[PDB]
Scaffold this active site. Structure first.
Site, mmCIF file in Angstrom:
data_model
loop_
_atom_site.group_PDB
_atom_site.id
_atom_site.type_symbol
_atom_site.label_atom_id
_atom_site.label_comp_id
_atom_site.label_asym_id
_atom_site.label_seq_id
_atom_site.Cartn_x
_atom_site.Cartn_y
_atom_site.Cartn_z
ATOM 1 N N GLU A 1 0.907 -1.207 0.038
ATOM 2 C CA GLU A 1 -0.001 -0.032 0.137
ATOM 3 C C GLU A 1 0.998 1.262 -0.032
ATOM 4 O O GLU A 1 0.666 2.195 -0.834
ATOM 5 C CB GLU A 1 -0.886 -0.089 1.106
ATOM 6 C CG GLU A 1 -2.030 -0.994 1.150
ATOM 7 C CD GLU A 1 -3.113 -0.740 0.047
ATOM 8 O OE1 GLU A 1 -3.223 0.375 -0.330
ATOM 9 O OE2 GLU A 1 -3.788 -1.678 -0.176
ATOM 10 N N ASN B 1 -7.364 9.001 -6.219
ATOM 11 C CA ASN B 1 -7.949 8.140 -7.083
ATOM 12 C C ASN B 1 -8.964 8.754 -8.132
ATOM 13 O O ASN B 1 -9.140 9.904 -8.183
ATOM 14 C CB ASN B 1 -8.828 7.408 -6.108
ATOM 15 C CG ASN B 1 -7.889 6.388 -5.180
ATOM 16 O OD1 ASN B 1 -6.758 5.941 -5.821
ATOM 17 N ND2 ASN B 1 -8.082 6.359 -3.869
ATOM 18 N N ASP C 1 -11.983 8.621 -8.493
ATOM 19 C CA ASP C 1 -13.136 9.058 -7.957
ATOM 20 C C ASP C 1 -13.071 10.461 -7.221
ATOM 21 O O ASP C 1 -14.126 10.618 -6.376
ATOM 22 C CB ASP C 1 -14.063 8.234 -7.254
ATOM 23 C CG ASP C 1 -13.268 7.883 -5.819
ATOM 24 O OD1 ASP C 1 -12.244 8.269 -5.475
ATOM 25 O OD2 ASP C 1 -14.024 7.190 -4.945
ATOM 26 N N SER D 1 -11.241 11.038 -4.469
ATOM 27 C CA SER D 1 -10.603 10.698 -3.208
ATOM 28 C C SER D 1 -9.057 10.564 -3.222
ATOM 29 O O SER D 1 -8.570 10.422 -4.279
ATOM 30 C CB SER D 1 -11.335 9.345 -2.627
ATOM 31 O OG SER D 1 -10.765 8.214 -3.347
ATOM 32 N N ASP E 1 -5.964 8.555 -0.856
ATOM 33 C CA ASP E 1 -5.585 7.459 0.202
ATOM 34 C C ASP E 1 -4.377 8.084 0.833
ATOM 35 O O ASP E 1 -3.341 8.477 0.196
ATOM 36 C CB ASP E 1 -5.095 6.169 -0.501
ATOM 37 C CG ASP E 1 -6.240 5.505 -1.368
ATOM 38 O OD1 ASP E 1 -7.548 5.836 -0.716
ATOM 39 O OD2 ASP E 1 -6.200 4.762 -2.191
ATOM 40 N N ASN F 1 -8.750 5.614 2.847
ATOM 41 C CA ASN F 1 -9.374 6.479 1.850
ATOM 42 C C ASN F 1 -10.431 7.642 2.219
ATOM 43 O O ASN F 1 -11.197 7.706 3.257
ATOM 44 C CB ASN F 1 -10.294 5.454 0.863
ATOM 45 C CG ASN F 1 -10.760 6.299 -0.169
ATOM 46 O OD1 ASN F 1 -12.047 6.664 -0.335
ATOM 47 N ND2 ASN F 1 -9.911 6.260 -1.250
#
Ligand SMILES: OC[C@H]1O[C@@](CO)(O[C@H]2O[C@H](CO)[C@@H](O)[C@H](O)[C@H]2O)[C@@H](O)[C@@H]1O
Ligand SMILES: [Cl-]
Ligand SMILES: [Cl-]
Ligand SMILES: [Cl-]
Length: 129
Positions: A35, A46, A48, A50, A52, A59
């Site tokens: 990760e 990301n 969308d 968002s 992380d 998220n």
């Protein structure tokens, strides 16, 4: 900061992640490797809208509030900025909510694709714990 493998295993064990909701410690160390490459400050945007955040790439649409993500749910009730600390407490506390609310560790895309199904015990092999 950048954790060492066994360093992070020890810290995650002290924070109660070993076997949490059915996931042995190696799962969580492997998750952090793929990760964030063990970096507590890793961040990734990301498709969308968002982002992380942190060692476990938590998220901003579902879990933490970063004030720039539409439809934010903030199910961990924590600002995303807190998840970039070198101390993993807030990330671990939120990860326990994530793995309790849905389908286990499958929320973590990198774990899903690059850890799940392998011998994850190898990630804590040779560590003091
Ligand atoms: O986390 C809920 C839900 O969102 C998805 C969508 O891809 O994963 C997002 O959230 C994860 C946990 O914070 C991130 O690690 C991931 O990168 C992010 O896409 C689903 O996998 C998950 O079930
Ligand atoms: Cl393990
Ligand atoms: Cl690699
Ligand atoms: Cl091995």
């Amino acid at each position: 900061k950048v954790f060492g493998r066994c360093e992070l295993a020890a810290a995650m064990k002290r924070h109660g992640l070993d076997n949490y909701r059915g996931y042995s410690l190696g799962n969580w160390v492997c998750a952090a490797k793929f990760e964030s490459n063990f970096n507590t400050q890793a961040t990734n945007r990301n498709t969308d809208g968002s982002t992380d955040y942190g060692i476990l790439q938590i998220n901003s649409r579902w879990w933490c509030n970063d004030g720039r993500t539409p439809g934010s749910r903030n199910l961990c009730n924590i600002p995303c900025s807190a998840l970039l600390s070198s101390d993993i407490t807030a990330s671990v506390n939120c990860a326990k909510k994530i793995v309790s609310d849905g389908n286990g560790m499958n929320a973590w895309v990198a774990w899903r694709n690059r850890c799940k199904g392998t011998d994850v015990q190898a990630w804590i092999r040779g560590c003091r714990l």
